[PDB]
């Protein structure tokens, strides 16, 4: 189906998902000198104290750490958000080289990787209904740069060997997502879409200004994963990022000056 290769990559997605050329697609380049500081933006509230992780799965495009979202255990509120959004999963997008990998860019600068913590608006009952709404999801995006190791990320790095190929999953309970957050919660926000097919335009993007640092050793293990399934020719899971899309009729707001 769709992928990140030359014959099934981002350039081809519009054929099966025409919304790929839509009015509010993601990611986008964040021009820091065009973003407007919005003093009306309420404080961002990340409540991950009761977060309940369940499993880690290699889905052939990236790996997802899933959470129990039957209750308001881990939620995102405040900021440009109205209501409560429950955390359902997080995953990353990374490159084959340290100079690329992130989906959003800042003044055209590409980071080594990007973490996406996905949340859905509880007013819609379930994730499936939420993705069909303009304000159905809220995704917290965090850039990763290569530097010092990130303690909170090692638990994830340690289990990647058990889900090397597509379809593989492993138990992943008691993981605290709070360990992946930078010190500052300053952010940029704009209305966008999922960055992978079906590319639904149901996302309120909240991209943090401050990146987190990960070690070269940690990123290297990400690059050892496989897009292919067990018993098939090896295709390293790298460069699973969509490039920046036209901003069009949208404004990016900043929570800071
Ligand atoms: C289109 C549809 O019917 O439902 C929407 C889809 O939601 C997908 O979940 C994420 C996706 O997680 C993945 C791919 O595991 C997420 O991260 C990716 C693709 O790497 C992207 S992203 N980059 O914008 O954060 O968004 C997708 C939308 O859901 C979000 C943001 O929470 C589901 O899993 C996928 C695509 O793998 C996907 O499941 C499919 C397709 O079978 C689909 O959900 C449904 C109803 O199946
Ligand atoms: Zn993503």
Overview of the structural elements:
Belongs to the alpha-carbonic anhydrase family. Its cofactor is Zn(2+); Co(2+). Keywords: Acetylation, Cell membrane, Cytoplasm, Disease variant, Lyase, Membrane, Metal-binding, Osteopetrosis, Phosphoprotein, Zinc. The chain is mainly beta and 257 residues long. It has a single domain, classed as Carbonic Anhydrase II. It has 3 helices and 15 strands. The strands form 2 sheets. Strands 2, 3, 4, 5, 6, 7, 9, 10, 11, 12, 13, 14 and 15 form a 13-stranded mixed sheet that branches. 38% of the residues are buried. The structure holds a molecule of 2 linked components (Z3K-Z3L) and zinc ion (ZN). The site of a molecule of 2 linked components (Z3K-Z3L) has 17 residues, from β7, β9 and β10.
């Amino acid at each position: 189906h769709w992928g990140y290769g030359k014959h099934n990559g981002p350039e081809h997605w519009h054929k099966d998902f025409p919304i790929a050329k839509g009015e509010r697609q993601s990611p986008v380049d964040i021009d820091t000198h065009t973003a407007k500081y919005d003093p009306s933006l309420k404080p961002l509230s990340v409540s991950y104290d009761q977060a309940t992780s369940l499993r880690i799965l290699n889905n052939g495009h990236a790996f997802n750490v899933e959470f129990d979202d039957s209750q308001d255990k881990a939620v995102l509120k405040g900021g440009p958000l109205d209501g409560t959004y429950r955390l359902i999963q997080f995953h990353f997008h990374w490159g084959s080289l340290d100079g690329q990998g992130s989906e959003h860019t800042v003044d055209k600068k590409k980071y080594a990787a990007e973490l996406h913590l996905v949340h859905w608006n509880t007013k819609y009952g379930d994730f499936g209904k939420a993705v069909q709404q303009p304000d159905g999801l809220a995704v917290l995006g965090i850039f990763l740069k290569v530097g010092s190791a990130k303690p909170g990320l090692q638990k994830v790095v340690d289990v990647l060997d058990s889900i090397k190929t597509k379809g593989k999953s492993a138990d992943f309970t008691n993981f605290d997502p709070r360990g992946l957050l930078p010190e500052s919660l300053d952010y940029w926000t704009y209305p966008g879409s999922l960055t992978t097919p079906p590319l639904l335009e149901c996302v309120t993007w909240i991209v943090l200004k401050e990146p987190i640092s990960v070690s070269s050793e940690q990123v290297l293990k990400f690059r050892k994963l496989n897009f292919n399934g067990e018993g098939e020719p090896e295709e390293l899971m790298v460069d699973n990022w969509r490039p920046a899309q036209p901003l069009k009729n949208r404004q990016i707001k900043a929570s800071f000056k």
